């Protein structure tokens, strides 16, 4: 999750298998023109 230049960007990746080994890039999923201020999440 990133928030830059008034855009919210979400990248995602899924895999069927403590964190595993190996390399696997994440592909872009969604961009949103929301333009708010973000400081905390849950």
């Amino acid at each position: 999750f990133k928030n830059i230049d008034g855009y919210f960007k979400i990248y995602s990746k899924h895999t069927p298998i403590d964190l595993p080994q190996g390399f696997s890039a994440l592909e872009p999923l969604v961009d949103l023109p929301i333009g708010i201020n973000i400081t905390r999440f849950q």
């Binding site: 008034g6 855009y7 023109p33 929301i34 333009g35």
Partner: protein, 48 residues
């Protein structure tokens, strides 16, 4: 006026009672107003 009509107590509404028999400059006009915003913004709405 204790919530009742009377002298100096007028209901602030008035009816139109539109009829097809009025003059040309008397029938109701259907009006719309479109307002834009020319500023720096994400610019969600844009033309074809």
């Amino acid at each position: 006026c204790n919530g009742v009509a009377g002298f100096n107590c007028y209901f602030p509404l008035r009816s139109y009672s539109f009829r097809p028999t009025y003059g040309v400059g008397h029938q109701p006009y259907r009006v719309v107003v479109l307002s834009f915003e020319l500023l720096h913004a994400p610019a969600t709405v844009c033309g074809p």
